[PDB]
Design an enzyme around this catalytic site. Structure first.
Site, PDB file in Angstrom:
ATOM      1  N   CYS A  84      47.460 -89.295 -43.916  1.00  0.00           N
ATOM      2  CA  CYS A  84      47.581 -88.332 -42.823  1.00  0.00           C
ATOM      3  C   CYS A  84      47.274 -86.947 -43.373  1.00  0.00           C
ATOM      4  O   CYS A  84      48.164 -86.198 -43.778  1.00  0.00           O
ATOM      5  CB  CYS A  84      48.969 -88.391 -42.199  1.00  0.00           C
ATOM      6  N   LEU A  85      45.988 -86.609 -43.401  1.00  0.00           N
ATOM      7  CA  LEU A  85      45.521 -85.311 -43.863  1.00  0.00           C
ATOM      8  C   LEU A  85      44.577 -84.743 -42.816  1.00  0.00           C
ATOM      9  O   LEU A  85      43.656 -85.431 -42.369  1.00  0.00           O
ATOM     10  CB  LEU A  85      44.824 -85.423 -45.221  1.00  0.00           C
TER      11      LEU A  85
END
Ligand SMILES: Nc1ncnc2c1ncn2[C@@H]1O[C@H](COP(=O)(O)OP(=O)(O)OP(=O)(O)O)[C@@H](O)[C@H]1O
Ligand SMILES: [Mg+2]
Ligand SMILES: [Mg+2]
Lengths: 147, 985, 76, 75
Positions: A84-85
């Site tokens: 989750c970037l």
């Protein structure tokens, strides 16, 4: 794309990343295998995590696909290795290098973000029972990230 | 009652109400030449109630220059009579008629009246009537490389939509006591001063939820103001706002009034002094025709030019026009008076058809009022254009010879073009080439490639295909149709069903490309565009690119050694949502539709593929156990779809669908709320479920509810399709089966060695052996949006709406769900016509071999707002290499098939450069940092041998060259860019 | 100096600039007001596409000038 | 001088600042009091977003001005 990728690779070769080492798989320039060392001041200390990086045909105009290959017990990394970037989905710009992505991933490992989680159960454990989260992270990094 | 199977792409541009109003409007078209027939074709494809034609003039040979419904066997027959029969086939819902005579009062039956090829006195007589009876009037004219449009919709025209954009909506963060509305973090409202918005779900200020629009005062990209909201409350939190679009009143002037004081629309801001000239010139043309029994000036005739200029002087003096007349431009208008170009006809027909639709729908902003256009930069300069070469020869190309001449006709007739794609733009391009006479000479040829087949929705804007052609290849049908239009093309067109890409280089190789003259793209994706652009750059061929989207369009030209390629510029990318948003925290219907599509793939596609691959590959289990990121998932899928949950009837499919409903709409939500209760707070003390995060609520299955039943039906039907069972649609069986269902208990789990591998092995060996199952396969479900009987869109809509009900999102219908899930691109016939016209106007520039970069134009337009703009192409960048001028794009190195060591030595000795990296395709052939042993192994090999060894694949026999990318450094160590290398095998 | 930029979708933008500003500054201002990266912006004035590295005075862009912000389309 | 910062939940935080203080220093004070990282603080005054590297005086912030603090969430 080839010239940009080779420039990044040479830049990595010139100045070592110290805490990381990325390079092409075999002779394919659009498929790299990177390594990340668990931060000392984190539950993953003393761990080696392998990531697979896939540069698209449109690089650097589309983000590279970065996936963890080692199992990690993190609120923002699920069983498929997805990370989750923001800079990898919709905030990607043709001005970010792989070294910046690796630094961002290491910073993410050093402190998770349970307020916007990808794995709600691990985020709940982190928010409520911190010690159990620490023990689980140490167990997972010893079981998978070492060896 | 709109047939959405045909108007699928057009409804996404116009809408249901717009098309409903269109289906009740009558259109009269006076004149049946190229411009008139183009307008009528576009109107018939659009879907107006009916079309009436009026043109009693007998056919002549020159009329075939741009009239593609006329043949040489129709000479001497009135044009309307011979055109109506062919126009009646385009659309079955639009009758087409002919009237032998026109009376003024007869005009009261029509919603719109279009006038072409009519004198100015007749136009004044018609407009004097239409204006006072509130009938939309459009008058179009096409003279050589010049065109004019005039619109008059009445004094009280009401426009409901002025730009064609969807209403803007956004999520608020806070509204102060003074009306300062602030958006969420890093979110732009996109409003402008004077807009109107309405608020909903605003907490703390209920008065703003009534729904009254309020003026907007933009104070920045992230905040705006609505006025004083003191009385309604003190401060408001959260909520959403939606833009309100208000009607506008546009007042038009009659033709008689507007001749004296015209209002211009400028298609190009680079030449703003011209439209005043064309206004006088066209009136002078009308006067000249009135003074010579309706005869226009002869081509390139100086006496007629002088008389025409005298008329222009007289008109300018009469109208008190304080404008100095440009003699050269006006006499140019005189010379090309008898010109009739299919490209100009297509361009103006698309524009005028869009104006007709605006008149009949009261949508989009109309032209107000005069639109004068010229493409005078297309006039050839490499040939002789004089009175001798421009005189008619009694052939079908007279209308074009009157502008370009016979020598340019010979140049056109020997073209060797290559058209990629046969969609809407492809069909328009083929029609334009057939009319222009392209490739009708001894050495001419046309090649068209397209791997797709005709479908029902394609008939709405691809006029070369008929309902009988559904299911056949596009390229063959297009070639046959254009061979019918222009019989001289019989045997001069070759059609391929090949996709243009890396896999088809054996057909479109060096020999194929070396014979071409130009390449024209008619594609619908960027990957193919980039590939064709790279091929054209390598072979140094001109390229014509064009694209459309709804009412917008663009056209670009790539010229060897002059301009930059198509891939030298960047376009905005597609938006993909974060995985965390789709997985757990959706707040828009798009998120739920994406989730539903992923669910469809994961339920009906991936497990079936795993099961089938297990029964085919002998070593599937071992490879999966160390290749996939979750072999346990693969094993569980195989077990569930083979033994555990294999249905034997449709009742078991219904029970499975009920179980999946529980899994995906009741249990995962309960688990999520167990992890993050609705009263939970973040690490900073803020509530967790605030803003972009909406608290969900579990759904309880109710058979009477429509969405639940729709989901059950679609899921059961798709499962039966997977297992090949006989599905049913009678609600009785569903209600009977679902009545006797006992939900297994569910309780959210709080959590709290190496034996897992043993469990995986036990699961793996528990599966039936592949040998015991030979000839048994499960049919996977391949997503298909255009079929309304496979339950794909039904399932996606039901799942999306159920997940929206979970998170309190407003559900969408099948129309919007199909638009979003199918990645449908809105399409219109008018935009296609305009882009084809512009591309064919650039084609004549390419044929003439113009060298200066100021003579070419890239075009952009938006017909919803009446915007046209043009700009010169960007010149290719230059660079200095070893003190020599090098083109960054179009230059290359040509070397023999030498060894790697010899290549390095050549670059060292000749260019004075040190080679640091050498790559081919997606492989690194050589790098300066490789270990000495590897290099010493790879140095004495030829480039072909090195490529074959590294890529582990022998070069094909048809491969005649290799393209290598090389990065090298100078003596001082500074990196210097160099062009690619072309190794000749 | 004040200039106007009209988008292909009908929106209008007002920019406060000076004759000596480079095209890069104008593109950055447009990015600030619209969020479009400078490398994805296509600006047209009087039939010329504005290129990076030059100034406004090179194109004779004066006060109350109108530029067009355009983009390419992938359908067809 | 003194200023007030109102959050999205209706809370009011009072800060002692000077017109010459930089925006960075004010965000540092807000981080020290509430623990919100400066990078995630979005301060708005009179319809304008306060930017790092400037001072309050640049925005004509005077005695007992009122700001609004919202927060962006890292993805
Ligand atoms: N790589 C390619 N090589 C050859 N032809 C292609 C390629 N990609 C697309 N095409 C063809 O280009 C044409 C695109 O035109 P268009 O988009 O109007 O048609 P469509 O995709 O069939 O229709 P729709 O998008 O309205 O469903 C189609 O014929 C498609 O088959
Ligand atoms: Mg198709
Ligand atoms: Mg398509």
């Amino acid at each position: 794309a080839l010239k940009r990728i080779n420039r990044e690779l040479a830049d990595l070769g010139k100045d070592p990343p110290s805490s990381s080492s990325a390079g092409p798989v075999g002779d394919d320039l659009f498929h790299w295998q990177a390594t990340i060392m668990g931060p000392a001041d984190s539950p993953y200390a003393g761990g080696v995590f392998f990531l697979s990086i896939h540069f698209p045909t449109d690089y650097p105009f589309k983000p590279p696909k970065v996936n963890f290959t080692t199992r990690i017990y993190h609120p923002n990394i699920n069983s498929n290795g997805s990370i989750c970037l923001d800079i990898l989905r919709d905030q990607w710009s043709p001005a970010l290098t792989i070294s910046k992505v690796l630094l961002s991933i290491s910073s993410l490992l050093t402190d998770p973000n349970p307020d916007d989680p990808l794995v709600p159960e691990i985020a709940h454990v982190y928010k409520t029972d911190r010690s159990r989260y620490e023990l689980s992270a140490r167990e997972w990094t010893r079981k998978y990230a070492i060896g | 009652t709109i047939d959405e199977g045909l108007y699928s792409r057009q409804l996404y541009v116009l809408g249901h109400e717009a098309m409903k109003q269109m289906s009740q409007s009558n259109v009269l078209i006076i004149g049946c030449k190229g411009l008139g027939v183009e307008i009528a074709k576009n109107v018939c494809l659009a879907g107006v109630k009916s079309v009436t034609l009026y043109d009693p003039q007998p056919t002549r040979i020159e009329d075939l220059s741009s009239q593609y419904f006329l043949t040489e066997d129709d000479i001497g027959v009135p044009r309307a009579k011979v055109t109506v029969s062919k126009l009646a086939e385009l659309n079955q819902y639009v009758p087409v008629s002919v009237v032998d005579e026109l009376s003024t009062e007869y005009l009261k039956n029509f919603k719109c009246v279009v006038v072409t090829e009519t004198s100015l006195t007749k136009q004044l007589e018609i407009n004097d009537f239409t204006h006072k009876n509130h009938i939309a009037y459009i008058a179009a004219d096409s003279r050589g490389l010049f065109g004019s449009i005039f619109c008059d919709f009445g004094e009280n025209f009401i426009c409901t939509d002025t730009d064609g954009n969807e209403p803007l909506t956004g999520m608020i963060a806070s509204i102060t006591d003074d009306g300062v509305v602030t958006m969420l973090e890093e979110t732009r409202h996109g409003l402008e001063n004077g807009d109107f918005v309405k608020f909903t779900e605003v907490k703390g200020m209920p008065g703003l939820n009534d729904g009254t629009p309020r003026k907007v005062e933009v104070k920045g990209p992230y905040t705006f103001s609505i006025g004083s909201v003191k009385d309604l409350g003190s401060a408001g939190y959260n909520g959403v706002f939606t833009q309100v679009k208000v009607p506008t009143k546009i007042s038009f002037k009659s033709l008689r009034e507007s001749l004296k004081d015209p209002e211009y629309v400028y298609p190009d801001f680079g030449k703003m002094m011209r439209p005043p000239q064309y206004h006088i010139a066209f009136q002078a043309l009308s006067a000249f025709a009135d003074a010579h029994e309706g005869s226009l000036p002869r081509p390139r005739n100086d006496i007629d030019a002088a008389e025409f200029f005298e008329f222009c002087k007289k008109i300018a003096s009469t109208l008190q026009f304080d404008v100095e007349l440009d003699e050269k431009l006006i006499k140019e208008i005189s010379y090309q008076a008898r010109g009739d170009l299919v490209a100009m006809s297509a361009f103006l027909g698309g524009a005028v058809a869009q104006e007709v639709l605006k008149a009949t729908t009261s949508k989009f902003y109309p032209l107000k009022q005069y639109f004068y256009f010229d493409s005078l930069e297309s006039l050839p300069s490499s040939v002789t254009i004089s009175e001798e070469t421009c005189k008619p020869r009694g052939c079908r190309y007279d209308g074009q010879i009157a502008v370009f001449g016979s020598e340019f006709q010979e140049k056109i007739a020997s073209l060797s073009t290559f058209l990629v794609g046969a969609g809407a733009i492809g069909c328009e391009m083929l029609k334009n080439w057939a009319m222009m006479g392209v490739a009708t000479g001894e050495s001419g040829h046309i090649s068209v490639t397209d791997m797709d087949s005709i479908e029902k929705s394609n008939l709405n804007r691809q006029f070369l295909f008929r309902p009988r052609d559904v299911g056949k290849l596009k390229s063959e049908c297009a070639s046959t149709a254009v061979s019918i239009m222009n019989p001289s093309l019989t045997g001069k067109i070759t059609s391929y069903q090949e996709r243009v890409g890396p896999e088809s280089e054996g057909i479109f190789g060096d020999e194929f490309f070396e014979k071409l003259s130009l390449v024209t793209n008619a594609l619908d994706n960027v990957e193919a565009r980039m590939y064709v652009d790279r091929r054209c750059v390598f072979f140094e061929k001109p390229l014509l690119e064009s694209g459309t989207l709804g009412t917008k369009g663009n056209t670009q030209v790539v010229v060897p050694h002059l301009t930059e390629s198509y891939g030298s510029s960047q376009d905005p990318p597609e938006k993909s949502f974060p995985i965390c948003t789709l997985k757990n925290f959706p707040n828009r219907i798009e998120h739920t539709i994406a989730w539903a599509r992923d669910l469809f793939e994961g339920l009906f596609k991936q497990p079936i593929d795993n099961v089938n691959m297990y029964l085919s590959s002998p070593n599937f289990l071992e490879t999966s156990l160390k290749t996939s990121s979750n072999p346990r998932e693969v094993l569980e899928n195989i077990r569930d779809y083979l033994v555990t949950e294999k249905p034997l009837s449709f009742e078991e499919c219904i029970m499975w669908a009920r179980l999946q409903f529980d899994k995906f709409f009741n249990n995962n939500i309960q688990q999520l709320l167990f992890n993050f209760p609705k009263d939970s707070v973040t690490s900073t003390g803020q509530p967790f479920w605030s803003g972009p995060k909406r608290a969900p609520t579990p759904l309880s299955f109710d058979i009477h509810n429509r969405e639940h039943f729709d989901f059950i039906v679609a899921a059961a039907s798709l499962y039966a399709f997977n297992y090949g069972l006989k599905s049913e649609t009678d609600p009785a069986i569903y209600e009977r089966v679902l009545a006797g269902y006992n939900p297994p208990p569910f309780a959210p789990k709080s959590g709290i060695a190496n034996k897992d591998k043993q469990e995986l092995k036990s699961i793996a060996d528990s599966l039936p052996p592949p040998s015991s199952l030979v000839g048994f396969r499960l049919t996977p479900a391949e997503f298909e949006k255009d079929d309304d009987s496979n339950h794909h869109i039904d399932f996606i809509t039901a799942a999306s709406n159920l997940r929206a009900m979970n998170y309190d999102i407003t559900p969408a219908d099948r129309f919007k769900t199909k638009f979003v899930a199918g990645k449908i691109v809105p399409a219109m016939c008018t935009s296609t016509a305009v882009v084809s016209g512009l591309v064919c106007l650039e084609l004549v520039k390419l044929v003439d071999g113009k060298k200066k970069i100021e003579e070419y134009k890239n075009g952009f337009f938006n017909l919803a707002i009446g915007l046209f703009t043009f700009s010169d192409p960007i010149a290719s960048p230059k660079m200095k290499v070893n003190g020599k001028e090098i083109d960054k794009i179009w230059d290359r190195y040509n070397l023999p098939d030498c060894t790697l060591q010899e290549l390095i030595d050549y670059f060292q000795k000749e260019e004075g450069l040190e080679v640091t990296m050498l790559s081919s395709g997606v492989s690194l052939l050589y790098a300066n940092f490789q270990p000495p042993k590897k290099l010493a192994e790879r140095l004495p090999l030829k480039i072909s041998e090195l490529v074959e060894q590294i890529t582990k694949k022998k070069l094909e026999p048809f491969r005649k060259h290799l393209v290598l990318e090389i990065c090298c450094d100078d003596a001082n160590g500074e990196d210097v860019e160099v062009p690619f290398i072309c190794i000749k095998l | 100096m004040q200039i106007f930029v009209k988008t292909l979708t009908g929106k209008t933008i007002t920019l406060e600039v000076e004759s000596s500003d480079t095209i890069d500054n104008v593109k950055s201002k447009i990015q600030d007001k619209e969020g479009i990266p400078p490398d994805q912006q296509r600006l047209i004035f009087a039939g010329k596409q504005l290129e990076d590295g030059r100034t406004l005075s090179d194109y004779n862009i004066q006060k109350e000038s109108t530029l067009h912000l355009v983009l390419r389309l992938r359908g067809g």
